[PDB]
Design a protein around this motif. Structure first.
Motif, PDB file in Angstrom:
ATOM      1  N   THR A   1       0.659  -1.152   0.031  1.00 24.33           N
ATOM      2  CA  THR A   1      -0.068   0.151   0.061  1.00 24.33           C
ATOM      3  C   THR A   1       0.953   1.173  -0.303  1.00 24.33           C
ATOM      4  O   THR A   1       2.082   1.139   0.094  1.00 24.33           O
ATOM      5  CB  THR A   1      -0.766   0.087   1.151  1.00 24.33           C
ATOM      6  N   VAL A   2       0.243   2.490  -0.410  1.00 23.84           N
ATOM      7  CA  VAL A   2       1.231   3.661  -0.201  1.00 23.84           C
ATOM      8  C   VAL A   2       1.853   3.760   1.182  1.00 23.84           C
ATOM      9  O   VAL A   2       3.122   3.868   1.147  1.00 23.84           O
ATOM     10  CB  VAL A   2       0.318   5.038  -0.335  1.00 23.84           C
ATOM     11  N   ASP A   3       1.231   3.441   2.216  1.00 21.83           N
ATOM     12  CA  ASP A   3       1.971   3.559   3.577  1.00 21.83           C
ATOM     13  C   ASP A   3       2.811   2.109   3.798  1.00 21.83           C
ATOM     14  O   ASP A   3       3.376   2.148   4.842  1.00 21.83           O
ATOM     15  CB  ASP A   3       0.850   3.431   4.663  1.00 21.83           C
ATOM     16  N   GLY A   4       2.648   1.476   2.933  1.00 25.02           N
ATOM     17  CA  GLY A   4       3.764   0.019   2.859  1.00 25.02           C
ATOM     18  C   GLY A   4       3.293  -1.176   3.213  1.00 25.02           C
ATOM     19  O   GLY A   4       4.118  -2.021   3.223  1.00 25.02           O
TER      20      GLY A   4
HETATM   21 NA    NA Z   1       5.127   3.108   0.109  1.00 28.26          NA
END
Ligand code: NA
Ligand code: NA
Ligand code: NA
Ligand code: NA
Length: 124
Positions: free
Chosen positions: A62-65
């Protein structure tokens, strides 16, 4: 049209807010053959590669990882959309899109709940 190329970033809007609403200069290399893609994204210090075929589930982050299962579909001849689902956790709804303009700009969007970040690339 075909998304293959060595792509340089030329615009970016809302990257930190994608990041600020969430927890928390990439070059992009694409090879597309039919519905099969390889995408390598890298900064000066990090690199990642993904391999997928449109319509077939695969794993990425995800964007947040956080680890996710992804599925890409064509919205049109020039645009693909990807739905993501975390492998473990609760979180914002995340997704992304990639589309080509008639002029050959590659537009990425990334969405995390209601916040959208747009990045634009050209071939180098
Ligand atoms: Na990321
Ligand atoms: Na945060
Ligand atoms: Na990620
Ligand atoms: Na999420």
């Amino acid at each position: 049209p075909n998304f293959s190329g060595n792509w340089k970033i030329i615009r970016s809007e809302n990257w930190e807010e994608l990041l600020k609403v969430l927890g928390v200069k990439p070059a992009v290399e694409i090879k597309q053959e039919g519905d099969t893609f390889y995408i390598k994204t890298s900064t000066t210090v990090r690199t990642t590669e993904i391999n997928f075929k449109v319509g077939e589930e695969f794993e990425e982050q995800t964007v947040d990882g956080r680890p996710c299962k992804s599925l890409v579909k064509w919205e049109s001849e020039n645009k693909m959309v990807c739905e993501q689902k975390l492998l473990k956790g609760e979180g914002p709804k995340t997704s992304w899109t990639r589309e080509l303009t008639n002029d050959g700009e590659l537009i990425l969007t990334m969405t995390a709940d209601d916040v959208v970040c747009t990045r634009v690339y050209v071939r180098e």
